[PDB]
Write a protein that binds this ligand. Structure first.
Ligand code: HEM
Ligand code: HIS
Length: 394
């Protein structure tokens, strides 16, 4: 073995900081480790990670060409990638996001939190963090949220093949699950591809055609990204933010009384309890990073989130401190040219949804003695997140 062994991902804890602390401790011992359970090298050194994000010819996203994302944005390189990213970015510009907030997200958030009011105890993971992003996507598609709820097993099977692609069983199951969702995706595209379509998805598909990029594969892939990113991945950001607040009731009270603190609560939450495992790249040629060597063809995990607990940048990093200024730079969206294009929507949903929740329930508090457990792979996902978020509402 070229690298020391590590066990960074497959350790559960009731302490949501355990993952960030493990990443930092490992980074202090070695720049690159081999995670036996996850099954690939993990880059932990900031200089290597930032270098890798910028050198896309050496560290590509081409591993996505072998699976269900082939034909989509993430699998593109170079100028092809830049052209399609410019079109996707149009849908996440500030004015567009503000319109989604007024038209979809705030009203849906109010309905989601309303549905919780008749119960003394609820699980905010299933009944809030997952529900709100699902319903937003259902309304973007002009499509029933209840029908999207039935895809959960398929969504997570799709995702598991996108993170550990050295596992042929996981890859095949991702392909199987995509094939079992293709009927739904096709129906959504065809309905919203009509000239009489009145959805954001309809506008996206028209804009795709006005920008000369409107193949059927492009339409399927934007729908797929909105399901996998817009619903599932966003849910874990909402979940981890809620936990950070529930675990710090004095901070939760401050944020309820001053909702202008919500952006900081979300950004600090991304530092304190990141919801991603890391970010994949493919090494395209033999490369040396200081005294480390990586071989052509190797898929690696960039762990920029190992900097979340760098105490030289963020003193007392195990403290959830929404007052850190400047706010910590987010590492959960990747970096360089591939930095998540959907981040503005995810951030806005977390803010608007939490604003609705905290306003509706002045009594919100974690259930004592039913502590969430945090680990990579929660609910068979590819996120670091809780298994449950039980709360008392009144
Ligand atoms: C509106 C919701 C979302 C949508 C539509 C979305 C969509 C996408 C798309 C299309 C890409 C590929 C970008 C490219 O390669 O140029 C991407 C990448 C990514 N997204 Fe998202 N996403 C969403 C939410 C999130 C959230 C909530 C997180 C994490 C908290 C996240 C983390 C990432 C990461 C880590 C990447 C990889 C970036 C890289 O390779 O450097 N996404 N997303
Ligand atoms: N991993 C899926 C879903 C996702 C979007 N953003 C973060 N995750 C994808 O790359 O599309």
């Amino acid at each position: 073995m070229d690298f020391p062994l590590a066990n960074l991902f497959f350790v559960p804890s009731e302490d949501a900081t355990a993952f960030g602390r493990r990443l930092r401790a490992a980074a202090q011992q070695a720049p690159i480790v081999f995670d036996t359970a996850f099954g690939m090298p993990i880059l932990l050194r900031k200089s290597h990670i930032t270098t890798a994000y910028r050198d896309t010819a050496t560290f590509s996203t081409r591993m996505f060409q072998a699976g269900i994302l082939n034909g989509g944005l993430a699998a593109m390189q170079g100028d092809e990638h830049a052209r399609m990213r410019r079109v996707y970015n149009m849908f996440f510009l500030p004015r567009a996001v503000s319109q989604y907030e007024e038209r979809f997200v705030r009203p849906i958030s109010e309905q989601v939190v309303d549905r919780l009011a008749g119960k003394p105890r609820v699980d905010l993971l299933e009944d809030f963090a997952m529900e709100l992003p699902r319903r937003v996507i259902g309304e973007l598609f002009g499509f029933p949220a209840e029908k999207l709820h039935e895809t959960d097993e398929r969504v997570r099977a799709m995702l598991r093949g996108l993170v550990r692609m050295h596992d042929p069983a996981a890859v095949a199951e991702s392909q199987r699950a995509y094939g079992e969702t293709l009927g739904l995706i096709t129906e959504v595209v065809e309905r919203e591809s009509r000239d009489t379509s009145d959805t954001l998805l309809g506008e996206i598909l028209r804009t795709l055609k006005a920008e000369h990029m409107d193949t059927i594969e492009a339409s399927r892939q934007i729908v797929l990204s909105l399901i996998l990113g817009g619903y599932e991945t966003t849910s874990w950001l909402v979940a981890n933010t809620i936990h950070a607040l529930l675990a710090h009731p004095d901070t939760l009270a401050r944020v309820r009384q001053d909702p202008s603190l919500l952006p900081a609560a979300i950004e600090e939450g991304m530092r304190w309890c990141p919801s991603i495992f890391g970010v994949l790249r493919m090494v395209e040629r033999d490369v040396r990073l200081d005294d480390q060597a990586l071989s052509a063809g190797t898929v690696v995990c960039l762990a920029g989130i190992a900097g979340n607990y760098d105490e030289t940048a963020y003193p007392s990093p195990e403290v959830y401190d929404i007052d850190r200024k400047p706010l910590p730079a987010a590492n959960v969206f990747g970096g360089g040219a591939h930095f998540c294009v959907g981040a503005p929507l995810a951030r806005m949903e977390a803010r608007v949804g939490l604003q609705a929740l905290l306003a509706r329930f002045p009594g919100l508090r974690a259930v004592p003695e039913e502590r969430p457990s945090f680990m990579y792979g929660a609910k068979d996902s590819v996120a670091h997140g809780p298994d449950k978020l039980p709360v008392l509402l009144h």
